[PDB]
């Protein structure tokens, strides 16, 4: 059936819908908007569940009330929900609207131990998220950073058990770094980065520096140091000793460092997803993580922006398919971004390859047999953006005689705003929702399009890092159509 071609569309809710004071501010206003979405055929919505609002008062002082009133209203409006366990800061830059820090009691510990924060070579502390170096350090009033995350997710599961039982929540995305993405904070606008700066390595806090020196001593080179020649945030790769042609990234020292640095994210990801699987075990929910789409310098050999972010991806070393393989023991979804972007829209000197990056990451996921979802990175209201999302959602088009060979598990559109709901904009969005649904009407029962959610099974066994790293072998991507066969039309 054509309904086997249906890809669900979710919309991201406005930022700060429950504010920093844990108040669901405007139920009436949100409700008119949600009902517009329900009539346009949208399948669900997505919301951040900010750790800095919930566990603000102190360790295990959770207040779930205002998020319970929000989930109640989404359910009354007939929409499902993707929930993000957001363990990161919202906003906080100059010009930002809603600013929600991580818990003040965590920030107070940070006042006496600055090394709980990701740190660059200059010694600047990024406070958006806790460094992977403290994941198993019992320094937060007896808890390690992963026990804080685990406890938060167990409390969410217990206190929202009625919305979980009644099937409101489709999936739980677990925030794994800055902006909820599994990466280092290598391109902080708060420290002056501007596209397409290569960014900077964020491994200089004392826990990660110490771990690196222990690791180079075991490899037989105790003298090796953390990079001192990779430049600054706004550098271009050829003006740096680390990323130029035949530079340090290609030496024994550079490769060992890049393997260590990227391996820290796989393991960070693997251990917290272990806890998420335990917390939500038995629930009719899928688990997901978000990978960032870092497309600038993708078209040059060095892939510098990708490497400073922690994705050790080169033309001869796949740095994304190890992440897909890791997610398969957890039966999790890889949620990616840049689904709307065309290469032709990027400034030429950025050496930007969003279309190719997307084809590489989604093909890597389908090859590893996991489910792949995605978002647009920037707000777009035009038909060419929507037709690019429809092309990536079904790369080889609609199958008239079955399910597509390749299709995404879903797409979340970023952000519900008054601009989206403006008349000419919302008319084009309604056509996008239709074409995503492969010209079928909204289908309330996911089982009809083969998206039924079972009870969350326990994680399959730990895959050793060397088996994870066999997925670095480069493969050719699946074939993409030039343009979609299910066009919104201009
Ligand atoms: O707060 C900022 C922003 O943060 C989040 O986005 C992150 C994103 O997810 C990452 O992928 C990355 O983004 C970089 C991106 O990937 C690169 O491609 C590049 O962007 C270039 C565009 O790709 C390219 O098309 C062009 O953009 C032009 C637009 O096409 C054109 O329409 C106009 O853009 C204006 C917007 O239309 C307008 O709406 C307004 O945007 C604001 C948003 O409304 C607001 O929601 C917020 O956005 C968030 C975003 O939601 C998060 O996902 O702030 C926006 C900025 O104030 O203003 C735009 C103009 O300022 O003009 C532009 C060209 O000027 O060029 C760009 C740049 O070369 O760089 C991206 C990083 O800057 O990182 C971001 C940030 O973390």
């Amino acid at each position: 059936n054509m309904l086997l071609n249906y890809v669900p569309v979710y919309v991201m809710l406005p930022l700060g819908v429950v504010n920093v004071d844990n108040v669901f501010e405007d139920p009436d206003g949100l409700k008119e908007q949600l009902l517009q979405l329900r009539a346009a055929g949208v399948d669900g919505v997505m919301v951040d569940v900010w750790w800095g609002i919930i566990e603000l008062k102190g360790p295990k002082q959770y207040d779930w009330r205002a998020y319970r009133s929000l989930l109640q209203l989404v359910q009354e409006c007939g929409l499902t929900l993707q929930a993000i366990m957001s363990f990161h800061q919202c906003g906080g830059n100059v010009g930002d609207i809603v600013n929600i820090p991580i818990p003040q009691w965590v920030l107070d510990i940070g006042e006496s131990n600055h090394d709980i924060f990701y740190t660059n070579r200059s010694g600047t502390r990024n406070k958006e998220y806790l460094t992977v170096g403290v994941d198993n350090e019992p320094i937060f009033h007896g808890r390690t950073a992963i026990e804080i995350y685990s406890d938060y997710m167990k409390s969410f599961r217990e206190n929202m058990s009625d919305f979980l039982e009644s099937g409101l929540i489709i999936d739980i995305e677990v925030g794994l770094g800055p902006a909820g993405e599994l990466r280092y904070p290598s391109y902080p606008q708060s420290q002056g980065w501007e596209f397409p700066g290569i960014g900077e390595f964020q491994c200089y806090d004392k826990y990660l520096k110490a771990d690196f020196k222990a690791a180079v001593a075991r490899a037989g080179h105790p003298e090796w140091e953390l990079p001192d020649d990779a430049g600054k945030y706004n550098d271009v790769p050829e003006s740096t000793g680390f990323f130029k042609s035949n530079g340090t990234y290609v030496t024994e020292k550079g490769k060992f460092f890049l393997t260590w640095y990227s391996n820290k994210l796989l393991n960070h990801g693997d251990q917290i997803l272990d806890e998420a699987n335990k917390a939500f075990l038995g629930c009719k929910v899928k688990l997901a993580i978000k990978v960032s789409g870092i497309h600038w310098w993708y078209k040059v050999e060095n892939h510098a922006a990708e490497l400073t972010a922690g994705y050790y991806n080169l033309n001869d070393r796949d740095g994304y398919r190890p992440i897909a393989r890791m997610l398969s023991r957890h039966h999790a979804i890889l949620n990616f971004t840049c689904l709307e972007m065309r290469d032709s829209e990027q400034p030429s000197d950025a050496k930007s390859g969003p279309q190719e990056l997307v084809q590489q990451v989604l093909s890597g996921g389908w090859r590893e047999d996991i489910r792949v979802a995605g978002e647009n990175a920037l707000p777009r209201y035009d038909a060419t953006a929507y037709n690019q999302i429809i092309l990536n959602a079904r790369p080889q088009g609609v199958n008239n005689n079955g399910p597509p060979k390749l299709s995404m598990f879903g797409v979340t559109y970023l952000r519900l705003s008054d601009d989206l709901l403006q008349k000419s904009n919302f008319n084009i969005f309604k056509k996008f929702v239709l074409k995503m649904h492969a010209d079928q009407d909204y289908c309330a029962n996911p089982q009809k399009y083969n998206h039924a959610i079972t009870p969350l099974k326990p994680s399959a066994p730990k895959i050793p890092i060397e088996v994870l790293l066999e997925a670095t072998k480069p493969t050719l991507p699946f074939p993409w159509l030039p343009e979609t066969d299910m066009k919104v039309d201009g």
Side-chain angles (χ1 to χ4, degrees):
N1 207 175
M2 281 297 268
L3 198 52
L4 253 16
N5 290 268
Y6 191 113
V7 179
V9 179
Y10 305 88
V11 177
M12 181 67 127
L13 289 191
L15 232 39
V17 73
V18 341
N19 69 15
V20 70
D21 298 314
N22 211 357
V23 173
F24 180 17
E25 289 184 284
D26 188 20
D28 304 298
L30 227 207
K31 183 183 181 164
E32 287 158 53
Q33 291 185 317
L34 257 27
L35 289 176
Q36 295 263 255
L37 259 34
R38 172 65 290 120
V42 171
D43 302 275
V45 292
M46 180 181 259
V47 73
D48 289 275
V49 188
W50 295 105
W51 170 42
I53 293 173
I54 308 305
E55 192 180 5
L56 183 59
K57 255 184 177 56
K60 286 147 143 295
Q61 302 279 84
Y62 309 113
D63 179 4
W64 293 111
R65 283 126 93 227
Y67 267 94
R68 286 195 53 89
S69 303
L70 209 215
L71 268 52
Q72 186 70 230
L73 177 69
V74 175
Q75 182 172 260
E76 294 162 356
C77 294
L79 291 152
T80 54
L81 184 104
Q82 301 174 119
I84 307 168
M85 300 295 100
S86 305
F87 300 111
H88 55 282
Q89 173 178 289
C90 190
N93 307 134
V94 183
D96 279 331
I97 31 168
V98 40
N99 307 289
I100 299 145
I102 63 166
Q104 185 63 50
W105 64 266
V106 175
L107 253 33
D108 290 330
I109 291 167
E111 300 281 38
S112 65
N113 183 167
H114 295 128
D115 294 281
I116 63 165
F117 298 119
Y118 283 126
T119 299
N120 73 343
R121 202 175 80 265
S122 292
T124 304
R125 270 58 240 220
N126 192 149
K127 297 190 177 181
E128 283 169 41
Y129 186 79
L130 254 25
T131 183
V132 54
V134 296
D135 276 3
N136 297 119
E137 291 297 323
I139 60 167
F140 304 95
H141 296 290
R143 288 189 295 171
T144 72
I146 293 178
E147 291 169 340
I148 292 174
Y149 305 149
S150 188
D151 288 346
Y152 184 89
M153 292 189 278
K154 291 174 185 297
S155 180
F156 181 84
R157 188 248 170 101
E158 288 165 1
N159 289 283
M160 303 298 184
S161 41
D162 56 331
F163 298 112
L164 283 163
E165 273 169 45
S166 69
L168 183 73
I169 306 156
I170 297 296
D171 65 85
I172 305 295
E173 185 166 288
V174 352
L176 253 22
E181 301 166 336
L182 179 67
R183 61 167 178 92
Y184 292 92
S186 56
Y187 55 107
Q189 293 236 269
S190 55
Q191 289 179 235
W193 172 85
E194 297 175 331
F195 173 86
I198 62 176
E200 286 180 31
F201 288 121
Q202 300 294 138
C203 49
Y204 298 93
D205 64 80
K206 79 175 180 183
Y207 296 99
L208 287 182
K209 181 182 302 169
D211 186 69
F212 171 75
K213 294 252 64 181
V216 291
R218 291 194 303 284
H221 288 278
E223 80 285 345
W224 284 351
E225 291 292 310
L226 242 23
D228 47 57
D229 62 334
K232 303 298 193 170
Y233 293 116
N234 291 146
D235 282 345
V236 121
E238 55 265 39
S239 76
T240 71
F242 193 88
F243 300 107
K244 67 160 80 159
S245 210
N246 298 297
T248 312
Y249 80 110
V250 115
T251 62
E252 277 196 279
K253 190 175 93 74
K255 296 190 287 176
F256 184 86
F257 168 71
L258 290 172
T259 301
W260 168 86
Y261 187 68
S262 56
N263 275 176
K264 287 286 153 176
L265 291 180
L266 284 182
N267 284 315
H268 176 77
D270 196 36
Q271 291 163 29
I272 293 172
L273 245 20
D274 255 316
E275 294 301 309
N277 210 286
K278 283 166 216 162
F280 291 103
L281 220 208
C283 294
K284 289 175 142 65
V285 118
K286 249 80 186 165
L287 247 41
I289 64 159
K290 190 170 173 180
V291 171
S292 191
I294 297 170
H295 65 81
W296 46 106
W297 303 114
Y298 181 89
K299 303 270 250 192
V300 291
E301 283 192 286
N302 52 263
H303 291 255
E306 287 164 278
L307 307 200
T308 54
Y311 305 136
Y312 188 6
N313 189 58
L314 304 180
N315 296 338
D316 62 353
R317 192 198 185 267
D318 199 318
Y320 297 105
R321 194 167 64 119
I323 297 171
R325 178 113 125 198
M326 183 275 274
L327 289 177
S328 69
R329 61 175 292 239
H330 298 290
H331 322 107
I333 299 164
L334 202 173
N335 185 201
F336 196 57
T337 191
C338 298
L339 248 57
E340 86 295 3
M341 304 191 151
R342 291 195 62 91
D343 293 10
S344 57
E345 298 167 343
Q346 314 309 321
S348 218
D349 75 296
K351 295 287 178 170
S352 168
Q355 295 176 252
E356 288 70 28
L357 174 57
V358 168
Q359 297 172 11
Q360 187 198 338
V361 178
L362 313 201
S363 297
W366 290 317
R367 172 138 191 159
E368 288 301 313
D369 198 36
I370 58 158
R371 282 161 303 194
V372 184
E375 304 177 347
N376 58 301
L378 290 171
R380 290 274 217 115
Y381 303 108
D382 61 288
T384 82
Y386 290 134
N387 290 322
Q388 194 48 217
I389 294 175
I390 294 160
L391 176 57
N392 291 312
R394 282 190 307 266
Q396 281 162 210
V398 169
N399 191 359
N400 299 100
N401 320 98
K405 179 166 60 60
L406 306 165
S407 60
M408 292 184 81
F409 194 70
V411 174
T412 307
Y413 177 81
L414 253 64
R415 246 174 275 273
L416 210 202
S417 58
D418 302 330
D419 291 67
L420 180 59
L421 264 20
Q422 174 235 86
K423 189 252 193 177
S424 241
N425 286 341
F426 205 53
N427 276 2
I428 297 162
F429 180 80
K430 285 176 193 163
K431 290 193 187 70
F432 161 66
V433 174
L434 177 64
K435 297 297 166 175
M436 285 298 284
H437 289 176
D439 285 338
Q440 304 302 290
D441 290 349
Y442 162 70
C443 175
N445 190 355
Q447 197 179 309
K448 298 187 179 186
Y449 54 87
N450 200 189
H451 269 51
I453 302 175
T454 61
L456 228 203
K457 311 274 61 58
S459 293
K462 216 288 184 186
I463 301 167
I465 197 76
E466 55 280 356
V467 182
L468 248 20
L469 268 22
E470 295 171 15
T472 67
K473 184 176 82 176
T475 52
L476 295 173
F478 292 98
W480 256 239
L481 241 43
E483 65 180 6
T484 187
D485 59 339
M486 284 277 111
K487 218 98 63 64
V488 153
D489 294 280

